[PDB]
Amino acid sequence: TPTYGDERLLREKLLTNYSKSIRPVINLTKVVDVTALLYLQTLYDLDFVNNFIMARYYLGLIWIDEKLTWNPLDYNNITSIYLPKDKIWTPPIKMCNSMDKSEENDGVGELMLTYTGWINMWSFRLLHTYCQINAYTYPFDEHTCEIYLCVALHTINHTRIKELIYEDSKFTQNYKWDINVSGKVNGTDELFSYAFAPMYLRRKLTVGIIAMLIPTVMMTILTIFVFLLPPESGEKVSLATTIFLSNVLYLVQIDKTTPTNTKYPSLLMLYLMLLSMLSGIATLGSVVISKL
Amino acid sequence: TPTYGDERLLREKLLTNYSKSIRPVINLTKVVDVTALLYLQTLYDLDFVNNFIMARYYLGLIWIDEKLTWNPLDYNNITSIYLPKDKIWTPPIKMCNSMDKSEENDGVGELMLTYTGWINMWSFRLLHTYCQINAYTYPFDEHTCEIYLCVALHTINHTRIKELIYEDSKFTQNYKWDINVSGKVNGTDELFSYAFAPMYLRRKLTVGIIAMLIPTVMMTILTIFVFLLPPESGEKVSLATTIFLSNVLYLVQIDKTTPTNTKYPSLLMLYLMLLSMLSGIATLGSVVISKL
Amino acid sequence: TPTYGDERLLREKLLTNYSKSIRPVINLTKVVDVTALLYLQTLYDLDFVNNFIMARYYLGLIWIDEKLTWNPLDYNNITSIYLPKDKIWTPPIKMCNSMDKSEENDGVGELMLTYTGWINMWSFRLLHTYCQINAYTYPFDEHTCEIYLCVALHTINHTRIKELIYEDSKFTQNYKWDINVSGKVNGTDELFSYAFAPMYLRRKLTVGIIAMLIPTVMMTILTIFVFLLPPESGEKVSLATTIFLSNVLYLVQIDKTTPTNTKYPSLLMLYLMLLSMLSGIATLGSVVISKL
Amino acid sequence: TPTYGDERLLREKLLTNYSKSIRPVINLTKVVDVTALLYLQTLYDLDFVNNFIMARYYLGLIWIDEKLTWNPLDYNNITSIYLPKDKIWTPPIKMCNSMDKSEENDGVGELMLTYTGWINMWSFRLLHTYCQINAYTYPFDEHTCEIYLCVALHTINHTRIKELIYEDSKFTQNYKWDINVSGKVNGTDELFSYAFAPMYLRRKLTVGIIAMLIPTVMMTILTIFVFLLPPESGEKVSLATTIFLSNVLYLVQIDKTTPTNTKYPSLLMLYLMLLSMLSGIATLGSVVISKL
Amino acid sequence: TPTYGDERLLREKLLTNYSKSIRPVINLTKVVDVTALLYLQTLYDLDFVNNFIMARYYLGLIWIDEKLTWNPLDYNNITSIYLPKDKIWTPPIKMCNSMDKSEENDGVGELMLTYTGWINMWSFRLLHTYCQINAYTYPFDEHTCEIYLCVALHTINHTRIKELIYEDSKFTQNYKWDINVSGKVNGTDELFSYAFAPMYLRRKLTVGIIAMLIPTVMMTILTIFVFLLPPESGEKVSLATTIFLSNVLYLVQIDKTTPTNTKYPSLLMLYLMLLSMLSGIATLGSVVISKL
Numbered sequence A, B, C, D, E: 001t002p003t004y005g006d007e008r009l010l011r012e013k014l015l016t017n018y019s020k021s022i023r024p025v026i027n028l029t030k031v032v033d034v035t036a037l038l039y040l041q042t043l044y045d046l047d048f049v050n051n052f053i054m055a056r057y058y059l060g061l062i063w064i065d066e067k068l069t070w071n072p073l074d075y076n077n078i079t080s081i082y083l084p085k086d087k088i089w090t091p092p093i094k095m096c097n098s099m100d101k102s103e104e105n106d107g108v109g110e111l112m113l114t115y116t117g118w119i120n121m122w123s124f125r126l127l128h129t130y131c132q133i134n135a136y137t138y139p140f141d142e143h144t145c146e147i148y149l150c151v152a153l154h155t156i157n158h159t160r161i162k163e164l165i166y167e168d169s170k171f172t173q174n175y176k177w178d179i180n181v182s183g184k185v186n187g188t189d190e191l192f193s194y195a196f197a198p199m200y201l202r203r204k205l206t207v208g209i210i211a212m213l214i215p216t217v218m219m220t221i222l223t224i225f226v227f228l229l230p231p232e233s234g235e236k237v238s239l240a241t242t243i244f245l246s247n248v249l250y251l252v253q254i255d256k257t258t259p260t261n262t263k264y265p266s267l268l269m270l271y272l273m274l275l276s277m278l279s280g281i282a283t284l285g286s287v288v289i290s291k292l
């Protein structure tokens, strides 16, 4: 069986004439094809005001190193070792659409190398990735957030994202968003290789949403009556005043929640604006009636 | 008695042919069984809107190194030493359900080694761990937060969590949550070893909660009377208007506190929604009466 | 074709008598002319209360190194290599008008060197840059934010910003601000070289703005009527009281949004102040009428 | 007089056979007695909602090193030197009740060594230390925050906190809290040595607090009259309604300020709850009267 | 002319027998006199609730090294070089009244050395410096914030702040505060050397402030009339109720803005408290009249 000394010898031979900064190919004309695997662990939040989505991912990069092969029979049948990530060449992949808010405490700092040259490198990453949040159909809204991976500085002739496999680990259930992130896309080679995972998020119709809507619908009904109230009923003025005040409060509060950076406005905001306008017109009519 | 020079000699011999990156077993076929001990020090907070729990823990990992044994009689009876954590192999345990918000000022950076090879490594960790917060029975709500430990990258054939012993240190009393975190669980070996400590949290019925409820119950009574008020009492309109305004304010304020990511809705929110609906119906009936 | 060993030989020769801290000119009397390229990727936000603008840029510095030239025919036709940024002299350019909130996870840490001596060094930078935000014409407001680059400590006789090319990458569309940042400016040499990119930002007239304005205009109309209401109409007092309350609420809420550090005040704030003053005068007139 | 070369020789000899990781005693059976001195500089804040206190301290550790003695007559009368803190053994003292939010810009990173072996090591630390904040007697409330020092990992047989001397530097006056932190306590040796400084904080009766009291007392008086108002005065309904609305607003606002993690509730919260209940009962009585 | 090799030789000779941790004087009995130059670049904010002031400064330390002199005629007339700040002794000056929130991205990390021994070391520092904010005369308030520099650990017999020159760079204009920070003060030598720059800040009377006031003055007038309103006018009750509600809202909102840690209270808070008290007394008188 392999022993501690055998692996010490192997690690001594592997790193002898190895340069961490030279791309690991025998012939420099060859590209290193990196395959990326992005698995969502949990979707922490989807911030509308800041147009961001906060989530946690398991990102794994797989590639082949041609300087780091060995014959397992010469080392008591060692077929794979674990090296520190900072001793070996590693593809310069970046989350170039996101703020990577990971700590060093969540950093693995280690990779697995196989005797055939294949490296698997896995890590946890907390990402604040920018999303264009279209609140047009609020609260029945759907969004698409694209999480980008890209090769930092190297040309598509040096390092390439062969493929991006993106999935949902199903580690946690959200109960607020229906997440759909599953697929497999080739890399896009335009002066530098990149790819992105499309994450589709559909707000779930929790009856808390229904509770939020009940005041809106009943206030619409009540405003319809007060606008229909007889011209000289007797309580027109105060009733219309209070109802317009409530409508203004709702119109103010909805704006503070709906995003201001949207492709189209929320239909609910327009509906409440029209409702407040009609309430104001009803109060104006009541004032005119009082004049007469 | 042992002296400074004796320990200098011992530390010189221990680290001579030692590789920090090789797993510390004579035969590479043997697993290293790590036993983890997680003690709660203080539970800082249980953030409902963010679905997080912020707490401080004392985490201790115990394992055995077979490269780091010695005979105490050859070193003037030295039976244990303290080594910097970064000179020796340490298990790659991660809190893979948490944000580890510890500083380097709160990092011990040192471990204790015994002449038999047993290492104890203790640390303080401040964790923001994701919890699925079910506010269904608010404010009589109970929650379960699972704190996960997992071996980062290695297979269950290399490194394993033998056991996870989790307790409450009782260093501070909370006065807001009844914490129940005490037990001892074997690690789960599914392609990589992990375990989790279940923390049960029952909100304590402080009379501040009762103060928050008194307005709700008395407003229920008041709404019942105003809905029961005679059709032509004389103050029906204004009274019902103010009652509905207060009900809407309460329904709005409760939503800003109850979490929007919940398995089931809070019953109190539904109760206040129904109460506001009945208040609106009472105002509608008053309007109809005024019409007649 | 070039091989791994050829590039090892090249990198060994290049760095032999190279000093990272000496400015890279054969004759120390020559200046290093750096050309900077600033490309906006996404404009995250424009914070009015803090007078900041948060954005993401792709910054590239291009210069020429005279110690790091080679003949490609002596190295199997290698025409360019990639070096770690911390092994080579790099111009000390600073964003001396911004908080650089970039992480090490978003840091490229590598530059591309050509056989002629030309270095390209690219990076992603998240900048919180201070802007003097003039909310005079809110919500039809325009702003200019100047993003500064400057040579940290060296005199214009050592390092110089030859040029600054600034553009918009058009990676994302904003839907809230119309961004205009495109041009090319020579560096300014006054005891140390610097330059700045002017970013012109015009608020887009989204109909959400129109929804925000509708209450203001209709309240102006209604206040005009209530001030015009007959002296003894019958509901003057309560109507004017509620309308002044609403005007005060709007005047309070607008202040919390408009910035307090502005060259001139917002015209809308003055308009609402005058509207509230007229509402108060109307209530005063109603009180006087009630006295008579 | 001593010269640069003399101190170079001294520093060369002191560190010759010195091990930074070995506890600095000739005989390993001896304890190192550390004396800690904690001086408050300024108390930044006392956060009630988070149960924290933020302050700045100047912390000094004094101990004796037996490997680092010299005869000043052999070095041209050098009696003390200053060494970098990371070259020498320093006690592993932690603020194990606090979050240490200090930067490296506020880190001295240097200690003073005397020819007799005595080390003084001073530092500035910004601490967020957890406090159990009892708002029972708000706003005449007193609190006690214990700031803990403890030896990180070592047994009381290796490193001991001999003494903790804690004072107030009086650098700034607070005007909001009366701070009382002055004393001298032996360390507690229970499987590891620790100690704590008790900081007593009495809220100062600033008339801004009294101004906050003014509305509560006058509203109590007004509620007493409205509850005493004649059954058929004429304005009972509206007056009671508005007064109950104001009472509910006050009861809601006080809760958002008083902490929810308290040993006992604030008496002011209970008082306002009772007052709101009596206002509701008065409105109920008015409703009953209107029925009759 | 001097060449790359000449500077390589010079830098090789300068650092040969140089100790970065030894204070740079031939005779250890001599002090190193440091002159500090603090220039305000921009004043970001003056946070009243936290009692802080956030600003950006350009800080330059100038001193003389006696180990780092050379004859420029022996090095082809090289008269000054630039060294990395971490290779040379640097005075241990701290901003010991501030939180230094600077990043490594805004860190120059380099100093200029002249053949006569003189070192200039300049840097950008973003400081959060604690200020005792006296809101007594709000909004016509003036404040004094003292920014402290101090020698970290060394006695006045080793390192001294000879002088402190503070100015305003005038890079940006504030439009909210009139800043007056200009002067030149000797250092204070009391067991360790320190100095401070006094920054005087006078709130500018922007009409945004005048606008905030208009509601206060007109509400004072309106309260005066309602208190003067005839005992049986007819609308006394409702009018006084609404006036008191608005007064209470203003008194509540002003408190949330004025600081609670002040030498004296704000006069405006007392004025609004008195106005609310008089409004309450007017309502009490109206209640008494209704009783009669």
Ligand SMILES: C[C@@H]1CC[C@@]2(OC1)O[C@H]1C[C@H]3[C@@H]4CC=C5C[C@@H](OCCC(CO)CO)CC[C@]5(C)[C@H]4CC[C@]3(C)[C@H]1[C@@H]2C
Pocket: A096, A097, A148, A150, A191, C037, C039, C041, C058, C060, C062, C122, C165, C169, C171
């Ligand atoms: C998630 C995404 C990753 C980042 C990204 O979108 C978001 O950001 C975009 C900006 C692009 C760069 C803009 C300018 C240049 C300069 C050009 O060289 C001219 C030099 C010469 C001019 O005068 C000197 O004089 C080379 C190409 C380069 C670097 C672009 C590369 C692709 C980039 C990085 C794009 C990329 C898709």
Ligand SMILES: C[C@@H]1CC[C@@]2(OC1)O[C@H]1C[C@H]3[C@@H]4CC=C5C[C@@H](OCCC(CO)CO)CC[C@]5(C)[C@H]4CC[C@]3(C)[C@H]1[C@@H]2C
Pocket: A037, A039, A041, A058, A060, A062, A122, A165, A169, A171, B096, B097, B148, B150, B191
């Ligand atoms: C607290 C918890 C810790 C993290 C965790 O939940 C939360 O997150 C989950 C996601 C899981 C990984 C998903 C995908 C793969 C890829 C597979 O390799 C296929 C390669 C081949 C495919 O095509 C190449 O082509 C190897 C296994 C691995 C890495 C999973 C490991 C277990 C993980 C980390 C789970 C774990 C329980």
Ligand SMILES: C[C@@H]1CC[C@@]2(OC1)O[C@H]1C[C@H]3[C@@H]4CC=C5C[C@@H](OCCC(CO)CO)CC[C@]5(C)[C@H]4CC[C@]3(C)[C@H]1[C@@H]2C
Pocket: C096, C097, C148, C150, C191, E037, E039, E041, E058, E060, E062, E122, E165, E169, E171
């Ligand atoms: C985006 C922008 C970058 C930063 C910046 O605006 C914002 O900030 C401004 C402050 C300026 C410095 C102020 C003072 C001095 C001292 C002087 O030396 C006298 C020494 C002698 C006095 O008595 C000793 O006794 C040398 C020049 C220097 C360092 C200025 C350089 C330019 C600076 C950095 C300006 C620059 C434009």
Ligand SMILES: C[C@@H]1CC[C@@]2(OC1)O[C@H]1C[C@H]3[C@@H]4CC=C5C[C@@H](OCCC(CO)CO)CC[C@]5(C)[C@H]4CC[C@]3(C)[C@H]1[C@@H]2C
Pocket: B037, B039, B041, B058, B060, B122, B165, B169, B171, D096, D097, D148, D150, D191
């Ligand atoms: C400000 C304060 C500092 C931190 C502190 O309160 C706050 O936190 C408390 C938690 C305590 C630890 C809990 C458990 C153990 C395990 C035990 O070993 C059994 C091993 C064996 C079991 O089965 C293996 O199988 C050794 C002692 C130790 C480490 C305690 C030390 C004291 C600690 C750190 C206490 C300390 C006072």
Ligand SMILES: C[C@@H]1CC[C@@]2(OC1)O[C@H]1C[C@H]3[C@@H]4CC=C5C[C@@H](OCCC(CO)CO)CC[C@]5(C)[C@H]4CC[C@]3(C)[C@H]1[C@@H]2C
Pocket: D037, D039, D041, D058, D060, D062, D122, D165, D169, D171, E096, E097, E148, E150
């Ligand atoms: C901006 C400002 C910088 C910081 C500062 O205000 C704010 O903070 C103040 C606290 C002071 C220290 C308090 C206590 C001591 C102990 C004494 O030694 C006795 C040892 C002996 C006792 O028994 C052992 O047994 C030596 C002096 C020292 C360190 C003071 C130095 C000056 C300091 C740092 C002051 C300084 C002005």
Ligand SMILES: *[C@@H]1O[C@H](CO)[C@@H](O)[C@H](O)[C@H]1NC(C)=O
Pocket: A026, A027, C001
């Ligand atoms: C490199 O190129 C040569 C010639 O093209 C070829 O013979 C050799 O096999 C290549 N090396 C590898 C590893 O493919």
Ligand SMILES: *[C@@H]1O[C@H](CO)[C@@H](O)[C@H](O)[C@H]1NC(C)=O
Pocket: A076, A077
């Ligand atoms: C090497 O290990 C593999 C996997 O355990 C096994 O199948 C094979 O028989 C081994 N060969 C030798 C020579 O040990």
Ligand SMILES: *[C@@H]1O[C@H](CO)[C@@H](O)[C@H](O)[C@H]1NC(C)=O
Pocket: A180, A181, A200
């Ligand atoms: C996810 O979205 C894609 C494209 O929008 C669709 O093809 C796929 O069916 C969706 N997945 C599920 C589970 O609905």
Ligand SMILES: *[C@@H]1O[C@H](CO)[C@@H](O)[C@H](O)[C@H]1NC(C)=O
Pocket: A186
């Ligand atoms: C992706 O690349 C592979 C590799 O050649 C190719 O077979 C495939 O057609 C490409 N497109 C897709 C959608 O897989």
Ligand SMILES: *[C@@H]1O[C@H](CO)[C@@H](O)[C@H](O)[C@H]1NC(C)=O
Pocket: A001, B026, B027, B066
């Ligand atoms: C390693 O394996 C060999 C053969 O299986 C055995 O003799 C030896 O005792 C093992 N070493 C240890 C430390 O168990």
Ligand SMILES: *[C@@H]1O[C@H](CO)[C@@H](O)[C@H](O)[C@H]1NC(C)=O
Pocket: B076, B077
């Ligand atoms: C070694 O130390 C242990 C523990 O103090 C003691 O019991 C034993 O007698 C000692 N033996 C020798 C040889 O010193």
Ligand SMILES: *[C@@H]1O[C@H](CO)[C@@H](O)[C@H](O)[C@H]1NC(C)=O
Pocket: B180, B181, B200
């Ligand atoms: C804690 O919870 C577990 C399971 O929910 C239970 O068995 C145990 O009795 C509880 N502990 C206490 C002290 O109630």
Ligand SMILES: *[C@@H]1O[C@H](CO)[C@@H](O)[C@H](O)[C@H]1NC(C)=O
Pocket: B186
């Ligand atoms: C855990 O592992 C031990 C070790 O063999 C075993 O005896 C025990 O049955 C396992 N299960 C539990 C619940 O301890």
Ligand SMILES: *[C@@H]1O[C@H](CO)[C@@H](O)[C@H](O)[C@H]1NC(C)=O
Pocket: C026, C027, E001
């Ligand atoms: C340096 O200066 C000398 C004389 O002025 C000149 O001959 C030489 O070409 C210069 N070197 C370079 C690289 O321009």
Ligand SMILES: *[C@@H]1O[C@H](CO)[C@@H](O)[C@H](O)[C@H]1NC(C)=O
Pocket: C077
């Ligand atoms: C060197 O490479 C360039 C670019 O591929 C090519 O045009 C040229 O012919 C090559 N020369 C030799 C000698 O290989």
Ligand SMILES: *[C@@H]1O[C@H](CO)[C@@H](O)[C@H](O)[C@H]1NC(C)=O
Pocket: C180, C181, C200
């Ligand atoms: C951007 O602004 C500059 C100067 O204000 C102007 O010359 C240019 O035309 C503008 N660009 C566009 C696209 O309007």
